[PDB]
Amino acid sequence: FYALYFEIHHLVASAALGFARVAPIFFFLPFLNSGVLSGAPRNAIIILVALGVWPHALNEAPPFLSVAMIPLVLQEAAVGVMLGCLLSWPFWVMHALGCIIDNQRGATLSSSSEMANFLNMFAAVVYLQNGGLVTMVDVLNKSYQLCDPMNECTPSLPPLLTFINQVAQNALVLASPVVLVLLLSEVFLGLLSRFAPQMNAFAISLTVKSGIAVLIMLLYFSPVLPDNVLRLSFQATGLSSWFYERG
Amino acid sequence: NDISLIALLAFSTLLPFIIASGTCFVKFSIVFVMVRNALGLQQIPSNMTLNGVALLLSMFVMWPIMHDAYVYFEDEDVTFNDISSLSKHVDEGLDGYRDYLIKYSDRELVQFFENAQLKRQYGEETETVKRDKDEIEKPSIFALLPAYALSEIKSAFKIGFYLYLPFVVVDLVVSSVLLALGMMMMSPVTISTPIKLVLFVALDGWTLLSKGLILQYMDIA
Amino acid sequence: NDISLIALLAFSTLLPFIIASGTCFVKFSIVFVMVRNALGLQQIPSNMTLNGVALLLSMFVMWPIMHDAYVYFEDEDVTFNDISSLSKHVDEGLDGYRDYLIKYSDRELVQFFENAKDEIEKPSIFALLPAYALSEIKSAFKIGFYLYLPFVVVDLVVSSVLLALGMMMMSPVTISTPIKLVLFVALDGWTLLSKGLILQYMDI
Amino acid sequence: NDISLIALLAFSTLLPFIIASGTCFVKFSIVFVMVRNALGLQQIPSNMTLNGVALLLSMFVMWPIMHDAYVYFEDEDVTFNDISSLSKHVDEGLDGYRDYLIKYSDRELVQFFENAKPSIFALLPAYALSEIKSAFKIGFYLYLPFVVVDLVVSSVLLALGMMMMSPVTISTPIKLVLFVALDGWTLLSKGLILQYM
Amino acid sequence: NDISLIALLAFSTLLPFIIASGTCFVKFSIVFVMVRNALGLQQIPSNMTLNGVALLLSMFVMWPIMHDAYVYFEDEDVTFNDISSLSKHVDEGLDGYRDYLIKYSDRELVQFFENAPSIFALLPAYALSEIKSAFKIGFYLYLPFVVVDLVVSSVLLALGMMMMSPVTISTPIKLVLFVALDGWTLLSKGLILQYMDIA
Amino acid sequence: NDISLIALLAFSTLLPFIIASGTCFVKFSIVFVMVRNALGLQQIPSNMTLNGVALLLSMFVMWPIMHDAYVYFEDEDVTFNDISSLSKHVDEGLDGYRDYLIKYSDRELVQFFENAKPSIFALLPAYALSEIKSAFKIGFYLYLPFVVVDLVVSSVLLALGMMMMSPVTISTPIKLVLFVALDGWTLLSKGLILQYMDI
Amino acid sequence: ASEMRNAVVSLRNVSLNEFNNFLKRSGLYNKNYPLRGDNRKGTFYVSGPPV
Amino acid sequence: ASEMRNAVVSLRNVSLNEFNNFLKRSGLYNKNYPLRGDNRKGTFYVSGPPV
Amino acid sequence: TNRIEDPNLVTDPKELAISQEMISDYNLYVSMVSTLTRKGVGAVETLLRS
Amino acid sequence: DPKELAISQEMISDYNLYVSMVSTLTRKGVGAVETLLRS
Amino acid sequence: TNRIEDPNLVTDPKELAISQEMISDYNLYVSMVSTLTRKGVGAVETLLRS
Amino acid sequence: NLQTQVTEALDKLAAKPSDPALLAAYQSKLSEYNLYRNAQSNTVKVFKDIDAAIIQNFR
Amino acid sequence: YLDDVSAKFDTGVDNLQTQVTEALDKLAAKPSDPALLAAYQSKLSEYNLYRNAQSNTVKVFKDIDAAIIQNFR
C-alpha cells in the first residue's frame, strides 16, 4: 500500500510547475488582479486551475527528476508572461484608447485618470459575456500540448520585436475620428482669434472641448466599439506562430 | 470503523480552503473590495472587518446545505457489509452539495474540462462529449470546482461593473466643471469625494445590495 | 465546568473579530482616517497609533456589558437538572448585548434575516450582527461626509485667488495644506469630536 | 511571584503599542515627516531614519522614570501581609509615570473622562489628543518660511511674460538652502528637549 | 549536502535584485520610458508593458549563462582533499558570468574597489557604465523630437496664431510620424544586436 | 559562553536598522535619488535599482573596520576573572568604529546629548543630523548648474514669440548633455568615496 | 410563572410522612404547593418556585 | 404539538399495575395519555408532554 | 466519580471491566470535541487574518 | 521489514522535502516577477 | 555515518557520549550559519524596497 | 549486512531451544541488534528534521 | 516478516506440540510408572522454554518497528 501515498505525492509535485506557468496571468488580467482579489482564496484558485489543464496523467511519475530545477522556473515564468501579454492585448489598447481622449481634452496637464479606467472595465465585461472565459482556458490547455517542459520551448524572438507597434497602429486608428474634430475646432477657433484679437481663445478652448470630445464618440460608441473587443481577443489557433520547442 | 475517524480529521484540516473555493463566499468578498476601490478609499473601511461581514451571510445561506451533512453522517447504520454500497453511501451523501454546484455553474465551462481531462486521461482518440450528456450523466467533483469559481468571478464582476457606473459618471462631470473654470492645476479627486459618499448613503446601497444577493440563491416564504 | 472551559477559550480566539465587527469600534476607526484624508495626509500620524486610541474609546462603552457577564456567570445556580433552563440561563446573560445591538440596528433588515414584537422574544444573535455593522458603516460614512465639507471650502477659495491673479500653473497643495490644519486646531476639532462620540451612545 | 512574571511579560508585549501611544514618540515622529513634505520632497530621507531619530530621542526622556520603577521592582520588600498593602506598592511605583502624563494634558478633558490623582485610563486618550494638537501648530509655523518664497518667485515669473512656467523646480533648491543656512536640523533637535530638560 | 541547499535557496531570494542591478535590465528599462517621456503621454504604453518587454529580453541574455553554470556543476567530481581546490572549482563556474561582466565595465572603479579581478568591484562599475551608455542613445533619439515640435509652433508665429496652446496640436503629430517610421520596432531591434547575436 | 551568542543574535536582528541609520549609507542613498529629482524625472531610474548601488558602496568601506571586530573577539584572552576589565575590553573592541563616528560628527551637539571619549549611545543622533545637513549641501550643490539651465531656456523662448510653449521639453536635453559630457556619474561617486579611504 | 422548576428525588431510609413532619414543625409546609407521592415510598415529585 | 417525544422503558423488579397505583395514589394519573404495555411485565410505552 | 467513590463497586472484578470502559469513553469524547473545535476556530482564523 | 522499513524511512521523506522545495521556489520565483512588474 | 555503520563503536557507552556530542554540535553549527544567512539576507530586502 | 549474521543464529536455537551456550550468545546478538536499529532510525531523523527547518525559515 | 520469525520456531522443531500430548496421554493412562514420570518431566519442561522464547523475541521486535514508525514523523 505504498503507491497510494505516491499518487497524491506525484500530484503535489506536478502542481508546482503548473503554478509557475499560469500565475502571472492572474496578475495581468483586469478582473483577476490583486486589486480585485483577496489573499486567502487567491492561492486556492490558482492551484486547482492548473490541476485541470495539466497534460500528463497525475498518478504517473513526473519527468522533473533532478534535471535542472532553478532554470526551469524562469523558463515557465517567461512563457507565462507571454500568455499574459497576448491575452491582455485588447484591454491594453482600450486602456490606451481612453488615455488619448483624456489627454487631448485637457484634464491631465497637472503633470507638467479615471476615464481611461472606465473603458478598460467596460471591455472586460463585454468580453466575458459571450464565450469569454472559454477561450482564456483553451489557449493554456493547448499551450501544454506544444510547450511541454523538459523540452525548453521559447517565445520565438523574431516576431516579438513588432509587438509594440502592433498595438500602436491599433491605438492610432481607434483614436482616429475624435482627435481630428477636436484639432480642427481649435484652429477654427484660432482663426476667430485672428479675427478678434483680444479673445484669449486658449481659455475658451478648455471650456468647450470636453463636451465636444465626448459627444462625437457617442455616435459610434454603440455599434463600433464592442465588436472590435471580440475581434481582438487572441485565439488559440495562433499559438503555433509564437513558440517552438528546443529539443 | 476507527479509520473512519481518520477520514473525519483529514476532512477537518482542508475545510476553510474549501470555503476559499467551493462556496459562494468568493462572490461576496470580491464586490466588497470593489466598493472600497470604487469609492477611492484605500485602507478604510479596513477589510479585515469586511471579511467577517462577508462570511456571516454566506454561512447563513450555506447553512441548510451543510446541516444535512450532520443528519446524513450521524446515522447509526454507517457500517455496511459491501465495498460498493458503502462507497455508494458516501456518493449519495455528497449529492446535496453536488447539485447545488450544478445549478449555479456554467454549462459549457464545466463541459470543457471533462473533454480536457479525458484527452489527458487516455489520449486524443477518445471522442468528445457534447452538450447532450447533461440530462443523464453527472461529472466528477474535481472537474466542477474549477469551473464554479471562475464562473462566480464572472458574475461578481457583472455586479462590480454595474455600481462602478453611477460613481464614474460623477467623476467626469466634476473634472469638467473644474476645467470650465481655469482650475486645471487642481486635484479633482478631492472634490469628487464628498458627492461620492452621499450617492451611496442617499441611495442606501448597503441595505439593498445585501438583500439583493440572498434572493439570488434562496427565497423568502 | 470542563465544557465551559472550551467556551471561555472559544470567546477568546474569536474575540478580535467580534470587536472588529460587533461594536462601535468600527465607527471610531473609520472617522479617524478620513480626517487624515480630509487634510490631504497619507501617513500622518499612522495606522497604528490611530488604532490604539480607537480601541480604548470602545473599551469604555463595552466593558459594563462585559462586566455583568462575570458576576452573572460566577453564580452558584449552575447545577440544573434540566437542559432548557440552562439554555434559558445563558440566553439571559447575553441580553445586555442584545439591547445594545437592537438599539442601533434596523428592525426591518433583521426581520428579513429572520425569514431566512421584540418584547415577547428577542431576535437571534446571528440575525442582527450584520445589521448593526451595516448600519454603522452607513452612519460613519454619513458623518464622514459632514466634516469633509469645510475643508472643501479652503481648497476652493485659495484655488480661486491664485486664478484671481495670473498664476494658473501653480500647485495649490503647498499653500492650502498650511491653511488646512489651522482650521482644525483653532477650532480644536480633535478634542470636541471625541466628546460627542462618547455622548452619541452613552449619556453624560 | 509566578504571576509577577506575567506582569513583567504583560508590559513587554503591549510595549510596541505603548511606545505607539504612551510616550512622546507621537510628538517626535510627526514633525520630521511634516518637515519632509514641507520642502516638497516626497520620500527622499527615509521612512526609517526619521523613525530612527524619533525613537532614539524618546528613550532619553523616558529612561529616568523607568529606572525609578526599575529599582522598585528590583527591591525585595514589595511583599506584605494584606491585599491593599500589596496595592500600596503598585501605585507608588506607578506615580512617577503619571506626573508627566498630567503635565502635558488638559485637566477638563481628564475631568470629562472621570465619568467612566486621576487614573491612567483617563490620561492616555487625553495625552495623545492634546499632543497632536500642539504638534500641528509648530508644524504649521515651519510652513511659514516656505509659503512666502514660492509666492514671490511666481511673482517674478509673472513680472516677465512667463505665464507658461513651472515654479516648483526653481523654488525647490531655495526651499532647502534656506534650511541649511538656518541649520534647522540642530535647531529643532534642541527645542524639543527644553520642554522636558 | 545541506550546505549546498543554503546557496541554492538564497539565489532565488536574491534574484529580484540581480535582475534589478546586475544585468542589462538596467539599460533596457530606462530608454523605453524615456522615449515615452519624449512623446509626453505617461500612460501609453502603460509601463508594465514596457517593463514586460525589457524583462524577457534581459532574460534571453542571462539564459545561456544560466545554462552554462549547472552543466559544469552537473559533474559531481567536486569533492577533493584541499580546501582551496573546491574553492577554485566554484570560481570556475562564475567566470562564465564574469566574462560577460568584465566586457562592459570600465578600468577605473574595478581596481579602485580592490585597493580600498574581484567580483564585488564590478557590479557598481557595471550599472554606472550602463546608464551613461543609455543616456546618449536616448539623447540621439531625443534630437528628432526637438525639431518636430519646433516647426509646428513656428507656423503659428508665421500665421497670427501666437496665443494658442501648442502642446494640444504637436502631441498628435509627434505620435503619428513616429509610428509611421515604425520606430517602436526600430529601437528594440537596435538594442538587441548590441548584447547578443539575437534571433 | 552563551551570553556571547545571544548578543551576536541580537546584532543580527538590529543589523538592517544600523545600516539604515547608523553608518554613512544615508549620505549615499539620499544623494542618488537627489540627482533624479534634480533631473525632473519621477520614476527614472526606478529607485529599486538605485537602492542597490547605494548599498554596495557604503558596505565596501565599513568592512575593514568590521574585520577588526573579528580579530578582537575571536581571540582566547577573554577569560578575565574580574568583571570590570572585560567591560573595558569590549569598550576597546568597537574603538575603531567609535573613532569613525567622532570624525564626521559635530562636537558640541554630542556633549549636549550626553548631558542628557563621548558615549557611543549619545553620538548616534548627532552623527545623522550632521550627516543629513551635509547631505543637503551637496543636495544644493549638484542642483545648482540646472537652475542656470532652466532660466536660459526660457529667455531664448521669450526672445522669440514662442511664449505659449512650456520650456520643459527644451530644458531636459541640455539638462543631460551637461551631465554626460561632464561625466558626473564617475565624478560624484569617486568624490564621495575618496572622502573616507585612501589609495 | 415562567420560572417554575421541577425535579423528582428519592430517599433511602426516610419516608414521605416523616419528611412532611419536618416541614410542619419547622414552619415551611406550604399548603398551596404540596408534595405529590405515595405515603410510604422512597420517590416523590416536587415542583414550584426556585427558592 | 411538535414537541411531543416518546420513550420505552424496562423495569426489572416491578410491574405496571403498582406503578399505575403510584400514579393514582399521587394524583398524576392522566387518562388522556396512558401508558401502553402489557399489564404485568417490565416494558411499556410513554408519550406526552416533555414535562 | 460516584462509581469510583462507592467502595463496593471498586472491589468487584465484574464492575472493574465497566470502570475501564467509562474512563475511556470520557477520554475519547472530550478530546474529540477539543480537536474539532480547534480546527473550527482555526479555519475562521485563516480568512480574517489575511 | 527492519531493513525494508528503514530504507523506506528515507524514501518517503526525501520526496517530501523535494515537493516542498519546488513549491517555495515558485513563490519566490513569481514573487520576484510580481515586484519587478510593479518596479 | 561510519561511526554508526561500524557496530563496534555503537556498543561502547563512552563512544556513544562523544558521538552524542558529535551529533549535537552538528545541529548547532549548520543552524547557526543558516539563520545568520537568513538574517543576513533578511537585512537586504527592506533597504532595497526602502 | 548486520541483519544477515543476526538471522543465522535463530535456526540453531530453533532446532535446539534448550542449549545454554546458544541463547547466551543469542542474547548478546539480539540486544546488540536492538541497539543498531533504533540508533540508525533516530540518526537519519535529525538529518531529516534540520533540512525542513531551513525551508521553514526561508519560506 | 513477523510471521517468519514466528514460523522459525514452528519449523525448527518437528512435532513437539504433539510430542507433549501423546506423552500426557500415556501419563493419564498409568500415572505410577517411574520410566513414564521421568520421561515426562524431560518433555514437559521443554515446552515452557519454547513458547516464552517464541513470544519474547517477537515482543522485543514489536517495539523495534514501533520505534521505526514513530521516527517517520
Curated annotation (Swiss-Prot), chain A:
TM stretches of this protein: 11-31, 45-65, 81-101, 117-137, 172-192, 201-221
Membrane topology: Multi-pass membrane protein
Alphabetical GO biological process terms: protein targeting
Pfam family, one: Bac_export_1
Subcellular location: Cell membrane
Assigned keywords, A-Z: Cell membrane, Membrane, Transmembrane, Transmembrane helix, Virulence
Cross-referenced InterPro entries: T3SS_IM_R (IPR002010), T3SS_SpaR/YscT (IPR006304)
Entry keyword Cell membrane: yes
Principal localisation: membrane
Presence of the UniProt keyword Protein biosynthesis in the record: no
GO cellular component term of the entry, any: plasma membrane
Family: Belongs to the FliR/MopE/SpaR family.
Role of this protein: Involved in a secretory pathway responsible for the surface presentation of determinants needed for the entry of Salmonella species into mammalian cells.
Protein name: Surface presentation of antigens protein SpaR
Underlying gene: spaR
Swiss-Prot record, chain F:
Predominant location category: membrane
Coiled-coil stretches noted in the UniProt entry, renumbered to this chain: none
Family: Belongs to the FliP/MopC/SpaP family.
Topology within the bilayer: Multi-pass membrane protein
Keyword set includes Membrane: yes
Entry protein name: Surface presentation of antigens protein SpaP
PANTHER family, per the entry: FLAGELLAR BIOSYNTHETIC PROTEIN FLIP, SURFACE PRESENTATION OF ANTIGENS PROTEIN SPAP
UniProt keyword Membrane, yes or no: yes
Function: Involved in a secretory pathway responsible for the surface presentation of determinants needed for the entry of Salmonella species into mammalian cells.
Record Pfam families: FliP
Keywords, alphabetical: Cell membrane, Membrane, Transmembrane, Transmembrane helix, Virulence
UniProt-listed GO biological process terms: bacterial-type flagellum assembly; bacterial-type flagellum-dependent swarming motility; protein secretion
InterPro entries found in the cross-reference section: T3SS_IM_P, T3SS_YscR-like
TM region positions: 6-26, 53-73, 138-158, 162-182
Subcellular location, record wording: Cell membrane
Entry GO CC: plasma membrane
From Swiss-Prot, chains I, K:
Coiled coil: none
Protein name: Protein PrgJ
Role description: Required for invasion of epithelial cells.
Family in the record: To S.flexneri MxiI.
From Swiss-Prot, chain L:
Effect of R59E: Cannot secrete the translocase SipB/SctE and SptP. Retains the ability to assemble needle complexes, but is not able to invade cultured epithelial cells
Compartment(s): Secreted; Cell surface
Induction annotation: Negatively regulated by PhoP-PhoQ.
Disulfide bond sites: none
Disruption phenotype: The null mutant strain is non-invasive.
A GO MF label: identical protein binding
GO biological process, one term: protein secretion by the type III secretion system
UniProt entry keywords in alphabetical sequence: Protein transport, Secreted, Transport, Virulence
Reported effect, D49K: Can secrete only early substrates. Can assemble needle filaments in vitro, but shows a filament assembly defect in vivo. Can invade cultured epithelial cells
The protein's name in its UniProt record: SPI-1 type 3 secretion system needle filament protein
Naturally occurring in which organism (per UniProt): Salmonella typhimurium (strain LT2 / SGSC1412 / ATCC 700720)
Entire protein: shown range: 22 to 80 of 80
